RNA sequence: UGAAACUGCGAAUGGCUCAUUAAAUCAGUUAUCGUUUAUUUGAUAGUUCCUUUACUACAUGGUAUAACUGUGGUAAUUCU
RNA sequence: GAUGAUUCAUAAUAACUUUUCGAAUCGCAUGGCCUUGUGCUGGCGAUGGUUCAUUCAAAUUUCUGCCCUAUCAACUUUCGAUGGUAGGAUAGUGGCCUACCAUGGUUUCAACGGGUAACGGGGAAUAAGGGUUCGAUUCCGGAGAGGGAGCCUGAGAAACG
C-alpha cells in the first residue's frame, strides 16, 4: 500500500538466483534498471554467489567502489544493478569477460568470453515508432533506444549493437530456418531453430522450435530471442549448447564422468 | 471529500454494499469551476503527479476559430444564449463547453476586409492582386453574413474551461447553426 | 430511425467537420472503422445517418479482450440489451455438473437490429457505463 | 511591567522594569507598529518616540 | 577536519494485528486503443538580445533569512 | 510507419497562454595554438533540466470460482435504482455527480435479507479409493492504527512513531 515498495523477502526471490533458504530474511530487491527484475541478476548474486569473489556484499561494495567491474562498458558501481539477458559483464583486474546467458537448466551461466566478443552485445527489439520531429527508433529489449535506425528493421528482430558507440552494427530478420534462444517459459534456455509462426490475430502468437536432436517444442512469441542462422550464432552458446537432456540421459553422462 | 468511486453504490442487483474501505485519495472529486464572465481570474489546481490544473473562474476573452476560414482571433464574450444541460447556466452566465454564447466579431470582420476586400451586412496594386487571385470564396452564407450585419457571431465552447483554464470555440455554421437557431428562436 | 436530432444538443461525430463552401455529391462526411478481429463493418453503419458515440464502428470505442456469446434476453433499455451465458459448472466430489448462467448487459449499436431470441456475439470495450461493459460485433442469428 | 526596548542603528538593546502602572497607562489601546512619546512613560526618556514592534503577555 | 543551520532526499518501505468485510477481499486469467508514475537506464533542446542600434549584467545581476550575537516572556512543551 | 483494429505515432496550418522549459551550479585535471592579452581554446566527472522510451510501480478492469440459512420470496427506484444525451469533476474510463429524458435492472439455476465464535490464497491434519475438518500465524494480496470524519506536504498518504 501507500506506495513503491523496497524490500524483498528470501522465498520471494526468483528460484533462478539459486538463494538459500536460510541465512537472512532478506534477497537483494534489484534496483529499477534496464531490466525487469524477475529477468534479471543483481551484480552482488552475481558477484558473491555465482564467481565467489567476495564473501559478504560488504565485500561486492569494496570491490564495486573501486570501480573494477562494469558492465557493458559503463562502471555502475551500484550493488543490486539488474544486470540482464546478454549484457557484458568486465572485470579488468583478472581480465575477465562474461556474458549472461542461459544455461538449459534455466539458470543465469558463468559464460566466459574473449575480449573481441565484449565488444558487442545483441538486442530483440521491442518496438518501432517516429519519435518527435520525425525521427524514427527502436528499442531493444533492455530498453536502449537507438535513433536513425534501418527501415528493414522491424519488431522480434534482434540487432547488434556495439557498445562503444550505441550503433547498430548489422541485424538478423525473424523468418523460418533462424537460429533462437528462448528467455522465458517453461523452455528456458533451450536453443532450436525456428520451423514456422502462428499468426494468432488478438493475442500471443505461437512460434514451433526443433533442436538439434530433433526435439520440437513451442512457445509463446515473448520468450523468443533470434541469434542468427542455422549453424552460425552470433554469439558464443555457454556449454552444453541449449540441448535439454532428459534426467535418465543426465544421470547416464553423469555416470560417465564420475 | 467528494468521492470518485462506485463502491459506495448499490450493486446492479440492487443491494446495499458494506464500507469496504475508507475514501482514499487517488480517488477524489474536487468542487465545479463555474466559470462567469469578465475580469479574469485563473487559480491553479496542484493534481496527481505534479501536473498542474487551471481552474478558470470568470474568464473574459477567448480564442475563437471560424472553420470554414481556417482562422482564429481572439475575440471578446458577450453571453451564453443555450446550455444543453441546463437552463440556470444560460440565466447565471456560466461557461463550460458546449455553450452556444454570443462573441464580438468585428476581429473576423476586419480580417474579411483585409483579406477579400468586400464588407459584410449592410488601395495598393499588390492587395488588388491578391484580392482578384481569390475571387469566388468571399460569399460565405446568409446566416453568418446577417450576424455580422448585427456585429455578434454565434459561437460554441469546445474548449474546458475548468481544466485548462482557457474559453475556446469555434463560429456556428451551417445545419449545426440552423438546429441552435431553431432552438433560440422557439418560444 | 425517425429523427437523428432529438437530444438538445447537436448530435455529430466530433472532429468529423463538412466544409459549407463546396458542394459535391456523398453529402456528409461520416468517419467509420472497421473494428478488427475479422468481424465485417455492417453497411447500414456506413451507409447509416445515427451517431451513436458508443459504437464500434462509427463511435469512439475500441474491442479488446474477450469475445463472447450470449442470446438476447431482454431489449427493453435504450441501445442497450441483455444476454444471458449459459454454462455447465463442474462439482468434483458427486463427478457431474449443474447449469448455471450469467446476465450481461450489453451496448448495440443502431446498425444491428436484434429481439429477444436472436444469438449475438459481443466484444469487450472500455467500462461505457456502470455495469456495460461489452458491445455487439455481430448478430448472425434469429 | 517591562520594556524591552532596542536601539537598532548603534545595535544595542536593554530592558527596564517600570512601575507606577498610570505612565505606563499611555501605552494601553495601542497596536503594533504605532508610535508613542517618550515623556509620557518616564523623564529619563524625554522628547524620545518608541514603535511598539510586540511583545509577550 | 568538522558542530549547528539552510538546501536536497528519505520518513508512503519495513514491523504489528486480523476488527471490519460473503461477488467484497482473494485466486488463476485478461485489458488500458481508458490513465498517473519520484527514481533507474537509454535517447534527447544553435531559435528566448520579447517593440528584438544597448532600453542592460553575461569575463556572471537582486533580496533576504537561518545558524550566530545580544535583550526577553511563561508553572509548564521538540513554545518561541 | 505501425496495429486484429484507432480521429494512432508523427507531420502541417491558423491563432492562444494567465506565457512552461530551453544550466547566473559544483569537483579534480590543468593541457593546445598564437599578432602574447591573464587572449582564444580544451579533458574526465557531479548535480539539475523538457520530452519520449524503459524500469520500479499504481489505479481501474474481463472471465470463472466462496460457509450456513426459505421459522428470509420477492428486492432496487421522491434522496441513482437500470439505461440515453450533454456538461462537470477526475490522472484518466464510468450515475462518479448534476440537468433533462425513458422505465428499467436482479431473482427458485436461490435474488434480497439474516448469521458467521468469517480477512482470502499458497497451505495443514487425517485419510485404500472417494472425502471430512481446519488455515489469527514465517510467503502473496487486502485492511486498520481508540471510534468516526476532514486535510497538508509530496512522485506516491485520505499517512496516524
Ligand atoms: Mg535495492
Ligand atoms: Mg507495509
Ligand atoms: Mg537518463
Ligand atoms: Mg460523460
Ligand atoms: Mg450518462
Ligand atoms: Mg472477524
Ligand atoms: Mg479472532
Ligand atoms: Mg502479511
Ligand atoms: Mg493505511
Ligand atoms: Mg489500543
Ligand atoms: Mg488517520
Ligand atoms: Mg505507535
Same mark, same amino acid.
Given at each position: 500500500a501507500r506506495g513503491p515498495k523496497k524490500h524483498l523477502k528470501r522465498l520471494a526471490a526468483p528460484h533462478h538466483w539459486l538463494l538459500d533458504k536460510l541465512s537472512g530474511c532478506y534477497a537483494p530487491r534489484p534496483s529499477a534498471g534496464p531490466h525487469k527484475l524477475r529477468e534479471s541478476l543483481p551484480l552482488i548474486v552475481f558477484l558473491r554467489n555465482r564467481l565467489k569473489y567476495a564473501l559478504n556484499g560488504r565485500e561486492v561494495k569494496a570491490i564495486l567502489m573501486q570501480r573494477h567491474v562494469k558492465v557493458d562498458g559503463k562502471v555502475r558501481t551500484d550493488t543490486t544493478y539488474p544486470a540482464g539477458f546478454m549484457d557484458v559483464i568486465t572485470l579488468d583486474a583478472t581480465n575477465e569477460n562474461f556474458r549472461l546467458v542461459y544455461d538449459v537448466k534455466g539458470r543465469f551461466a558463468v559464460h566466459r568470453i574473449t575480449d573481441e566478443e565484449a565488444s558487442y552485445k545483441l538486442g530483440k527489439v521491442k518496438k518501432v515508432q517516429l519519435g518527435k520531429k520525425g525521427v524514427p527508433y527502436v528499442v531493444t529489449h533492455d530498453g536502449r533506444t537507438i535513433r536513425y535506425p534501418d527501415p528493414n528493421i522491424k519488431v522480434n528482430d534482434t540487432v547488434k549493437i556495439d557498445l562503444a558507440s550505441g550503433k547498430i552494427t548489422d541485424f538478423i530478420k525473424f523468418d523460418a530456418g533462424k537460429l533462437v534462444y528462448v528467455t522465458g517459459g517453461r523452455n528456458l534456455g533451450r536453443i532450436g531453430t525456428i520451423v514456422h509462426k502462428e499468426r494468432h490475430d488478438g493475442g500471443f502468437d505461437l512460434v514451433h522450435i526443433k533442436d538439434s536432436l530433433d526435439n520440437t517444442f513451442v512457445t509463446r512469441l515473448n520468450n523468443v530471442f533470434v541469434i542468427g542462422?542455422?549453424?552460425?550464432?552470433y554469439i558464443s552458446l555457454p556449454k552444453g549448447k541449449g540441448i535439454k537432456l532428459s534426467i535418465a540421459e543426465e544421470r547416464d553422462r553423469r555416470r560417465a564422468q564420475q | 471529500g467528494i468521492s470518485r468511486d462506485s463502491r459506495h453504490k448499490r450493486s446492479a442487483t440492487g443491494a446495499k454494499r458494506a464500507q469496504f474501505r475508507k475514501k482514499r485519495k487517488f480517488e477524489l472529486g474536487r468542487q465545479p469551476a463555474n466559470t462567469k464572465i469578465g475580469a479574469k481570474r485563473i487559480h491553479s489546481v496542484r493534481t496527481r503527479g505534479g501536473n498542474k490544473k487551471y481552474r478558470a473562474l470568470r474568464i473574459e476573452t477567448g480564442n475563437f476559430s471560424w472553420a470554414s476560414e481556417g482562422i482564429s482571433k481572439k475575440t471578446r464574450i458577450a453571453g451564453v444564449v443555450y446550455h444543453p444541460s441546463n437552463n440556470e447556466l444560460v440565466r447565471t452566465n456560466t461557461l463550460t463547453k458546449a455553450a452556444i454564447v454570443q462573441i464580438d466579431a468585428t476581429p473576423f470582420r476586419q480580417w474579411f476586409e483585409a483579406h477579400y476586400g468586400q464588407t459584410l451586412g449592410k488601395k495598393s496594386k499588390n492587395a488588388e492582386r491578391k484580392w482578384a487571385a481569390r475571387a469566388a470564396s468571399a460569399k460565405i452564407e446568409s446566416s453568418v453574413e446577417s450576424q455580422f450585419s448585427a456585429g455578434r457571431l454565434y459561437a460554441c465552447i469546445s474548449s474546458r474551461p475548468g481544466q485548462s483554464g482557457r474559453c475556446d470555440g469555434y463560429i456556428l455554421e451551417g445545419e449545426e447553426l440552423a438546429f441552435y437557431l431553431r432552438r433560440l428562436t422557439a418560444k | 430511425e425517425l429523427t437523428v436530432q432529438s437530444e438538445r444538443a447537436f448530435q455529430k461525430q466530433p472532429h468529423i467537420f463538412n466544409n459549407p463552401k463546396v458542394k459535391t455529391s456523398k453529402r456528409t462526411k461520416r468517419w467509420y472503422k472497421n473494428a478488427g478481429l475479422g468481424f465485417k463493418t455492417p453497411k447500414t453503419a456506413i451507409? @447509416?445517418?445515427?451517431?451513436?458515440?458508443?459504437?464500434?464502428?462509427? @463511435?469512439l470505442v475500441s474491442i479488446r479482450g474477450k469475445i463472447l456469446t450470449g442470446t438476447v434476453v431482454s431489449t427493453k433499455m435504450h441501445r442497450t440489451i441483455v444476454i444471458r451465458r449459459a454454462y455447465l459448472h463442474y462439482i468434483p466430489k458427486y463427478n457431474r455438473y449443474e447449469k448455471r448462467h450469467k446476465n450481461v448487459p450489453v451496448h448495440v449499436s443502431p446498425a444491428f437490429r436484434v429481439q429477444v431470441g436472436d444469438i449475438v456475439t459481443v466484444g469487450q470495450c472500455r467500462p461505457i457505463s456502470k455495469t456495460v461493459r461489452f458491445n455487439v460485433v455481430k448478430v448472425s442469428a434469429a | 511591567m517591562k520594556l524591552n526596548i532596542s536601539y537598532p542603528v548603534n545595535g544595542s538593546q536593554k530592558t527596564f522594569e517600570i512601575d507606577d502602572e498610570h505612565r505606563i497607562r499611555?501605552?494601553?489601546?495601542?497596536?503594533?507598529?504605532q508610535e508613542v512619546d517618550g515623556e509620557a512613560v518616564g523623564d529619563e526618556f524625554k522628547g524620545y518616540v518608541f514603535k511598539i514592534s510586540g511583545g509577550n503577555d
Open positions: 542462422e542455422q549453424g552460425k550464432p | - | 451507409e @447509416g445517418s445515427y451517431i451513436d458515440k458508443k459504437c464500434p464502428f462509427t @463511435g | 499611555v501605552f494601553f489601546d495601542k497596536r503594533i507598529g
